[PDB]
Each structure stands twice: as structure tokens, then as C-alpha cells.
Amino acid sequence: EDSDIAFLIDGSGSIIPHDFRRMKEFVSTVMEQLKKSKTLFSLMQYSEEFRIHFTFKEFQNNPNPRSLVKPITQLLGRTHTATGIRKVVRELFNITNGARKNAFKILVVITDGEKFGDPLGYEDVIPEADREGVIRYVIGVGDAFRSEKSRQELNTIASKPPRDHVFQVNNFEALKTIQNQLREK
Amino acid sequence: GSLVVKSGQSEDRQPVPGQQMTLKIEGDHGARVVLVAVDKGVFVLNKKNKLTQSKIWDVVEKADIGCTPGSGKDYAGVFSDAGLTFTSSSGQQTAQRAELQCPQPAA
Amino acid sequence: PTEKFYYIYNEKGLEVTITARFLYGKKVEGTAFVIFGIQDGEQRISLPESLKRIPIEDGSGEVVLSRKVLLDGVQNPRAEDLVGKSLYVSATVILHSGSDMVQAERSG
Amino acid sequence: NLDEDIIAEENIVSRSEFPESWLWNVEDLKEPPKNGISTKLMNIFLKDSITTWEILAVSMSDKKGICVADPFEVTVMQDFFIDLRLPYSVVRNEQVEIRAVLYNYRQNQELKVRVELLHNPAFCSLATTKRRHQQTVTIPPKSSLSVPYVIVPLKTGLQEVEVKAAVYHHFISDGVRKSLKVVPEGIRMNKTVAVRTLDPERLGRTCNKFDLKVTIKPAPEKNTMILEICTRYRGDQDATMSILDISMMTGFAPDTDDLKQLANGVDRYISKYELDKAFSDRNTLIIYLDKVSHSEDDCLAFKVHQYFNVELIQPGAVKVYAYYNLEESCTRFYHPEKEDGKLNKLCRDELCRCAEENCFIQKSDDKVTLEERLDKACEPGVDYVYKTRLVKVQLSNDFDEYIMAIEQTIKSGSDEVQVGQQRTFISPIKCREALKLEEKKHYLMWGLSSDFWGEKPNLSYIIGKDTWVEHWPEEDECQDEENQKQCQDLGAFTESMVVFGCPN
Numbered sequence: 045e046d047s048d049i050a051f052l053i054d055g056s057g058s059i060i061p062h063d064f065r066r067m068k069e070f071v072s073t074v075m076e077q078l079k080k081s082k083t084l085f086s087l088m089q090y091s092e093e094f095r096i097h098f099t100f101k102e103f104q105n106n107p108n109p110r111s112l113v114k115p116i117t118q119l120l121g122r123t124h125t126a127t128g129i130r131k132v133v134r135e136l137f138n139i140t141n142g143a144r145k146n147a148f149k150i151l152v153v154i155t156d157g158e159k160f161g162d163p164l165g166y167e168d169v170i171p172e173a174d175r176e177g178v179i180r181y182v183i184g185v186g187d188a189f190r191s192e193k194s195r196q197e198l199n200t201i202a203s204k205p206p207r208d209h210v211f212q213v214n215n216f217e218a219l220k221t222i223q224n225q226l227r228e229k
Numbered sequence: 230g231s232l233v234v235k236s237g238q239s240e241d242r243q244p245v246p247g248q249q250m251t252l253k254i255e256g257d258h259g260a261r262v263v264l265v266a267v268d269k270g271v272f273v274l275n276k277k278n279k280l281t282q283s284k285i286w287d288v289v290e291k292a293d294i295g296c297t298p299g300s301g302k303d304y305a306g307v308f309s310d311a312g313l314t315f316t317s318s319s320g321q322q323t324a325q326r327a328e329l330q331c332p333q334p335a336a
Numbered sequence: 337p338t339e340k341f342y343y344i345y346n347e348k349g350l351e352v353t354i355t356a357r358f359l360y361g362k363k364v365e366g367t368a369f370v371i372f373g374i375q376d377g378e379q380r381i382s383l384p385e386s387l388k389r390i391p392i393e394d395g396s397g398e399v400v401l402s403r404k405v406l407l408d409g410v411q412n413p414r415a416e417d418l419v420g421k422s423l424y425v426s427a428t429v430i431l432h433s434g435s436d437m438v439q440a441e442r443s444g
Numbered sequence: 445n446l447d448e449d450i451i452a453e454e455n456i457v458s459r460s461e462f463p464e465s466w467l468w469n470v471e472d473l474k475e476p477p478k479n480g481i482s483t484k485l486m487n488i489f490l491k492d493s494i495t496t497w498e499i500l501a502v503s504m505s506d507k508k509g510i511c512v513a514d515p516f517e518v519t520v521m522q523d524f525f526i527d528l529r530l531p532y533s534v535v536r537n538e539q540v541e542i543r544a545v546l547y548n549y550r551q552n553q554e555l556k557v558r559v560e561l562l563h564n565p566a567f568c569s570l571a572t573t574k575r576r577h578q579q580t581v582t583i584p585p586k587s588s589l590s591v592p593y594v595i596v597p598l599k600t601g602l603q604e605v606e607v608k609a610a611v612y613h614h615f616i617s618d619g620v621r622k623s624l625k626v627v628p629e630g631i632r633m634n635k636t637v638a639v640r641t642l643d644p645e646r647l648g649r650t651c652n653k654f655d656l657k658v659t660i661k662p663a664p665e666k667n668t669m670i671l672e673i674c675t676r677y678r679g680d681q682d683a684t685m686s687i688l689d690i691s692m693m694t695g696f697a698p699d700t701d702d703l704k705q706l707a708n709g710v711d712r713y714i715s716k717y718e719l720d721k722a723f724s725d726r727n728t729l730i731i732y733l734d735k736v737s738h739s740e741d742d743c744l745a746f747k748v749h750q751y752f753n754v755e756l757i758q759p760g761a762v763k764v765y766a767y768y769n770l771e772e773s774c775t776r777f778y779h780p781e782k783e784d785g786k787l788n789k790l791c792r793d794e795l796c797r798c799a800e801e802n803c804f805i806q807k808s809d810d811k812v813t814l815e816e817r818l819d820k821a822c823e824p825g826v827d828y829v830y831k832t833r834l835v836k837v838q839l840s841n842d843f844d845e846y847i848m849a850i851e852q853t854i855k856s857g858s859d860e861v862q863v864g865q866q867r868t869f870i871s872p873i874k875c876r877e878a879l880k881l882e883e884k885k886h887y888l889m890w891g892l893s894s895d896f897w898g899e900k901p902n903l904s905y906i907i908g909k910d911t912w913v914e915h916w917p918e919e920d921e922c923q924d925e926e927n928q929k930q931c932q933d934l935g936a937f938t939e940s941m942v943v944f945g946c947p948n
């Protein structure tokens with residue numbers, strides 16, 4: 045089977061630079077320790093404006109993740125989470141960027157759980173990921189769990205069940221649930 | 230053989246709408262399996278004429294050629310009651326079988 | 337009904353247990369409409385005096401048709417004609433919501 | 445903007461998929477067998493429907509043959525959810541009722557919900573585009589609440605309804621999204637006169653069992669009113685147990701003790717729990733009757749109280765039927781000023797649109813300068829801006845008609861308007877007095893191309909949420925020093941609108 049892995053990081057100002065560094069480094073480790081067959085990686089940084097830091101084509105041609113992740117900055121915008129997702133499903137999972145049909149499609153949403161200024165809601169874009177069939181792993185950060193409505197924003201983003209998908213970034217055993225879900229898949 | 234439909238992730242308290250579930254099917258080798266999931270709310274409206282493996286055998290056992298649970302009046306009827314014909318060179322033979330359906334007339 | 341049939345001399349009359357439950361796996365709290373009738377082959381006769389309006393208690397209920405009430409209805413009081421007649425029961429239960437409504441039946 | 449602590453409707457992923465059956469699947473058993481058993485594990489998705497999913501299967505191997513299975517049960521639910529209960533055969537262009545039941549299976553935690561009936565241009569609801577309809581409620585653990593919602597099916601066919609309920613100081617939300625069939629009537633033959641000029645210019649090359657009179661009256665001495673019902677049966681002999689479903693005008697509740705007083709009443713009964721239910725969200729009431737008469741009026745009445753203050757109030761609803769038959773029911777809606785309790789809409793030969801949004805664009809703001817005045821006049825939406833004089837007035841129950849005398853065409857739009865012309869502007873009856881409008885007065889007015897009632901040249905005008913109207917006095921009525929500031933901005937609005945025209 046075909047392992048298509050996408051990565052969506054928040055860059056909003058609410059992301060303190062230390063949270064942000066953890067994100068970039070955790071992603072790079074996620075890919076690194078996901079060194080395994082037939083896995084493809086693409087990334088976009090999301091805030092109030094979006095910019096895909098690498099596509100799948102650019103990844104099959106460049107396997108070194110550290111080379112892909114170093115140049116990434118913070119955006120310091122607003123937080124258009126909902127809009128970011130249609131940018132993931134409509135662009136990253138397009139055949140034009142490398143997307144293969146009948147592949148295991150996973151989205152890694154890495155944010156603190158605070159959408160703001162987004163004109164789009166979730167009731168259009170979440171059922172979209174499900175009608176397209178993308179299994180959504182969410183990685184909350186900093187104080188993504190201090191508040192109540194943030195952490196539920198996460199389960200709102202994460203596919204069900206959220207206990208199996210919602211994880212903190214510093215936790216090192218966020219991969220093994222998925223690293224393993226493929227070993228006989 | 231055997232066909233079984235059970236969950237494949239016992240480690241779940243209660244399924245949640247939208248969630249993926251691992252379904253463990255055990256079965257005969259090389260078989261084609263035909264599936265259905267029904268809202269049990271349907272059965273609240275109607276549950277007549279639903280399919281069972283035992284309804285299937287009812288059909289087959291109903292189709293049996295024998296027409297008696299036991300013996301017959303003589304050597305011959307034991308065979309014919311069982312759905313058999315016996316014929317020997319000496320002349321002893323089962324009666325004739327002239328009907329596809331069992332001999333109770335108007336039954 | 338307690339026993340699949342109706343015993344003609346059962347002094348109790350007939351005790352009936354109402355089980356009402358949601359599809360998802362939870363028990364229902366409400367109130368019931370119980371009506372009975374008789375069927376003679378293709379000929380059915382409704383039994384108007386027996387309708388009872390009765391509560392439903394934590395997914396469980398009991399209703400009792402006393403033999404006194406039972407016998408007052410009957411048309412021809414006791415005969416062999418009565419045998420060969422079966423009974424059917426129509427149940428209409430309304431939730432505390434007042435909204436959802438279910439028609440149920442035991443026949444034969 | 446009172447409280448900041450709820451999940452936004454805009455982010456409430458509803459329940460979507462409710463198949464009455466699915467997974468018609470056909471899968472093949474390739475697995476290396478152990479024990480003489482190949483084992484298959486098909487990871488799937490759980491539909492947005494809360495029910496136990498029964499699974500039925502059949503193994504057709506050519507060697508052993510067919511084989512039915514032991515059905516499999518997958519028990520699905522959430523702690524707190526909704527299910528929505530609708531009819532099936534509803535009729536377009538007829539006000540109806542729905543009921544939404546939120547269940548709570550949390551064992552010890554009560555809940556406060558803000559739930560919105562979601563806006564739909566296919567339905568005449570209380571929910572305009574911009575004016576939400578959010579009801580706030582509370583739930584006892586291990587209990588569910590019935591919420592009524594009366595609507596008008598404005599269109600035909602497969603219409604979906606949505607309601608999103610969100611909670612406070614807790615986690616989940618939910619949403620129901622469920623379709624059904626809407627259909628037409630076709631009569632349009634109500635007391636027609638022989639030639640009523642109904643025809644256009646360019647074409648061509650029901651309670652049959654029940655008497656039910658419900659009237660809600662007021663009280664003598666927050667606010668309490670009287671509910672009155674008056675019922676009968678039409679037949680040869682009196683009828684069996686009849687039922688009433690009664691639902692509360694938004695934020696209403698009956699008088700707990702008069703409720704008790706009535707239940708001891710002859711031929712009547714309401715169990716204790718729906719009778720000692722709490723004043724917190726006691727909202728839907730069911731009353732069962734021993735029998736109903738075919739011979740005369742047996743009425744009933746009792747008190748209702750106002751638990752929460754909102755200016756606009758869903759009609760109450762009252763649905764009565766024989767215990768055995770729901771489908772030959774009779775439904776009435778009540779409202780004290782709305783006769784027969786029906787929402788205001790606007791109707792032509794077979795079309796209607798919902799007239800229930802704010803009467804006109806909100807007045808009395810601190811800001812009345814040319815700057816904002818022009819901005820709402822320089823917007824593209826403004827098709828027409830006229831200045832007329834209130835010439836004639838047709839007042840009526842439905843709507844109240846103001847006959848306007850256009851002398852000048854300031855800015856025509858998609859309109860072909862001649863000079864010295866008389867045109868019909870409408871305002872709903874609920875709005876009439878709020879407008880403080882008098883004939884013989886000049887008015888400078890504006891609206892949109894979308895806000896034109898009819899087709900040419902037998903047309904009319906409608907004052908909507910965003911229509912702007914303002915009276916214009918005479919020359920002898922603006923010379924006052926008090927009235928300077930108004931007539932100042934009128935003169936400068938006009939001239940700079942006139943000279944410059946529109947910017948673009």
C-alpha cells in the first residue's frame with residue numbers, strides 16, 4: 045500500500061518560538077523515525093496566509109527531511125485553521141503534486157487549538173476530509189490543553205476517536221500508534 | 230465449515246459515530262462473502278421473511294425425495310418410502326414412482 | 337403475556353410485561369396504550385372495553401387484566417365456538433418527549 | 445456577546461449520514477488459514493447514526509457451499525446527542541411543527557445547552573440570515589428534553605433540516621441534518637370571483653375527525669396568559685381516548701398548581717412526572733383524555749408564565765388525535781396577535797416568501813451623518829432610491845399597505861419608472877405601529893432590486909430588514925430651528941448625491 049503523510053503546522057503568533065521549534069523538530073523526527081517504505085511527506089504552514097513548504101513531488105525528489113524543514117519560518121499571522129484544511133485536501137492530496145490514488149492518506153494537524161479569523165467553518169471542511177478519507181492526527185501544543193474549548197477544538201479537528209489521535213508534541217510516543225497501524229497494513 | 234463476524238478491536242468501550250472499527254471475519258477458504266449492515270430500526274417495522282441458515286436447510290429438507298420417516302409395508306416400500314427403487318432379475322421390484330410430490334393427495 | 341396462550345380458568349386473568357427500549361441500547365421512560373382483540377381465521381373482532389392507559393417505569397412495566405373485567409366483555413358467555421379464536425394486542429407508547437410514537441403488536 | 449464560552453455553530457460538525465441500510469459489501473477470504481480458518485479484518489467507518497448496527501453475512505465457497513452467519517452487533521452512541529423526529533408527507537406552503545429531542549445519558553452531570561434551529565431559505569422559520577434563533581436550556585442527567593419548532597416548507601421535495609446544539613463549560617456538540625419529502629397541494633380555488641385579474645400578462649403563445657378551537661387569552665392580575673382549547677368529535681357515537689400534544693411559546697410554562705387542579709379533573713389524567721417536572725425547562729406537555737364527545741364543546745384553560753424575556757415568541761402548538769390514529773390528526777398553532785398563530789409570509793399564485801425579519805434597517809443610532817447615510821446609499825445593492833409622499837393606505841390583518849407617490853426618479857435601477865407614478869409598498873402587520881407613519885407626508889426611501897414584489901407591470905414593493913425609509917416634511921415644516929439638523933443633512937445628501945451622482 046501507499047503511505048501519503050501530510051503535515052500542517054500552525055504559525056500564528058500564539059505559537060511561541062519554542063513551541064514552533066518543537067514542532068519543526070518533532071516533524072523531522074516523525075519523518076526520520078518513520079523511515080520506512082512507501083511513505084510520502086508534504087508540508088504546509090498555516091496562519092492567516094498559507095505557504096506549502098514542500099510538496100510530495102518535491103519530497104520524492106528530496107528525501108532528506110532536515111533539508112526540507114530547516115528553511116521554515118513563523119508567519120505570525122491570524123489562525124485560519126479551517127481554511128488551511130481545504131488547502132490540504134484540495135492541493136496536497138492532488139495528483140498534480142504527487143498524490144497517488146488508493147493510498148493511506150494522513151493529515152498531521154499541529155496547532156494549539158485556537159482558530160481565529162477564519163471565514164470557513166468545520167462543518168464543510170471536516171466532512172470533506174472524511175468524504176475524501178484522510179485519517180487526521182492532531183498534535184496540540186504549549187497550552188493547547190490548558191483551556192477546555194481548545195482541547196475540544198482538537199477533538200473537533202481529530203477524527204474519531206480523539207483519544208487515539210489527539211496527542212501532545214513533547215510526548216515521544218505519538219508515532220508508535222501510527223508507526224504500528226501500518227506494520228500489517 | 231464456519232463463518233464468524235465479531236469485532237477485531239475488543240479494546241473499545243463503545244463505538245462512536247464516525248469512527249473506524251476493525252471487524253474480524255472468520256471463514257471458509259476462498260469464499261466470497263456477502264455483507265449487510267441494517268439499522269435495527271427497520272426490524273421494529275418488519276422482521277418477517279428474514280434469512281437464516283436454518284431456513285435454508287428447511288428448504289433443502291423440504292425438497293427431500295423420501296416421503297416416510299421409517300420403514301414400509303414390505304421390502305419394496307422401505308425403498309420407495311426412502312426415495313429408492315429396487316429391481317432384481319427375479320421380478321421383485323419397488324412400486325412405480327409416478328409423482329414428483331409426496332403421496333398425500335390434497336395435502 | 338406470561339404464557340403464550342390464554343388459559344380459560346386462570347383466575348389472575350392475564351398479566352403482561354411491557355419491554356420498551358431504544359435502538360442504541362438504553363431503556364425508555366414513558367406511558368402506554370394497550371388494546372386487545374380477537375381473530376377468527378380472517379375475521380377479527382376488536383375488544384373495546386379492555387383498553388388500559390398505563391405508565392412505563394425505567395424500561396419496565398407490568399399490566400394486569402383482572403378476570404372480573406375480562407368476563408364482562410364476552411358476547412356468548414361460554415361455548416365451544418370460542419375455541420379456535422386467537423388474541424392480538426396493539427400497543428401505542430408515547431415518550432415523555434411527547435414526540436416519538438411506536439405501534440406494537442403481539443398476535444396469535 | 446454576553447458569554448464567550450460555547451462552540452461556534454460555524455464549527456459544529458453535524459450528524460450527516462443516516463442510511464436505513466448499507467454495507468452491501470462483498471469481500472474475499474484470501475488469508476492464510478489457521479485451524480482451517482482464514483480470518484478477515486475490514487477496518488471501516490461508523491455512520492453518523494446512533495443505533496445498534498446489525499450485521500448479516502453469507503459465505504459462498506464453491507467447495508463447502510453457502511453459510512449464513514450469527515448476526516453481529518455493534519453498539520454505537522455518545523454521552524449526549526440529539527435525534528430529530530419529523531413527519532414524512534408534509535405539504536409545501538403549510539406551517540407545520542417538528543420536535544427535537546436531545547438526550548443526556550451522563551449519570552450525574554446536568555447540562556446547559558444553547559441550541560439553534562439553523563436558517564434555511566427553503567423554510568419560513570424564525571431564523572433569518574443574520575438574526576439567529578438560539579434557545580438556552582438545561583438538562584437533568586439521565587434525561588432528555590423535547591423542543592418544538594414550527595416552520596413553513598417553502599419549496600418541494602427532499603428538504604434537509606439542521607439543528608446544532610452546543611454546551612457550556614463542557615466538551616461536545618452535535619448536529620442533526622435530516623431530509624424528508626415536501627409536496628404541493630394545487631387547489632388555489634378559494635372563493636374566487638369570476639374575473640379577479642389573477643391572470644398574468646405574458647403567459648400564453650384538515651381536521652376531518654376533530655373540531656378544535658384554540659385561543660390564547662390574557663390574565664387580570666413575569667407575564668402570564670390564558671390558554672383556551674375547545675374540542676369535539678364528528679361522528680355517530682362518542683370516540684375513544686384522544687391525546688393532546690401541547691408545546692410552549694418560546695420560553696413558556698404552565699401554572700404548576702392549576703395543572704395539578706386540572707389533572708384530578710374528570711375524564712383526564714397526566715402522570716406525576718410530566719406533572720411534577722421542573723420549572724427550569726418544562727416546555728412540552730402531553731395530556732391524555734379518557735374519551736371525547738361528538739355532541740358539544742368541552743373546553744379547558746390554564747395559565748402560562750414567561751421564564752425568559754425575548755421580544756419574539758414561537759407560536760405554541762396543539763396537536764390532537766385519537767389514541768389509535770396519529771395520521772388523521774388536527775394541528776393548530778396559537779399566538780395572541782397572530783390569528784390562528786401563523787407566521788407572517790408573503791404569497792402569490794403558488795409562491796411564498798418569509799416576511800419575519802427586522803422591519804427596516806435599525807434606526808436611532810448615534811451616527812446619522814451624511815458619511816454613513818451615503819455609504820448605505822453608495823452600496824451597489826441599492827437598486828432604487830425614491831422620494832415620495834404617503835398618498836393612500838390599505839390596512840389589513842395580513843399586511844399594511846402604503847401607497848407611495850413617486851414624483852422624481854433619484855436613482856432608478858433595474859426599474860422602469862415614469863414621472864408622477866403611484867406604486868405599492870408593503871409593511872407587515874407586526875411592524876405597522878413601530879414605523880410611526882402618517883399619510884400626506886413625503887418620504888425619501890430606498891431598497892434593492894431583490895426587494896420588488898411581483899413582475900411587470902403588476903408589481904409591488906416590500907420593506908425588509910435592510911430597507912431604509914425616512915419621512916420628508918414640507919418647506920413650511922423644516923424652517924424650525926429645532927428641525928435644522930435633519931433638513932440640513934437632507935439638503936446636502938440630495939445635492940452631493942445629485943451633482944456627483946453615484947461615484948460608480
Ligand SMILES: *[C@@H]1O[C@H](CO)[C@@H](O)[C@H](O)[C@H]1NC(C)=O
Nearest residue numbers: 629630631632633634635784
Ligand atoms: C382559504 O381562505 C382563508 C381565508 O378565508 C385563508 O385563511 C386560507 O389560507 C385559504 N386557503 C388557501 C388554500 O388558499
Ligand SMILES: [Mg+2]
Nearest residue numbers: 056057058123
Ligand atoms: Mg494564533
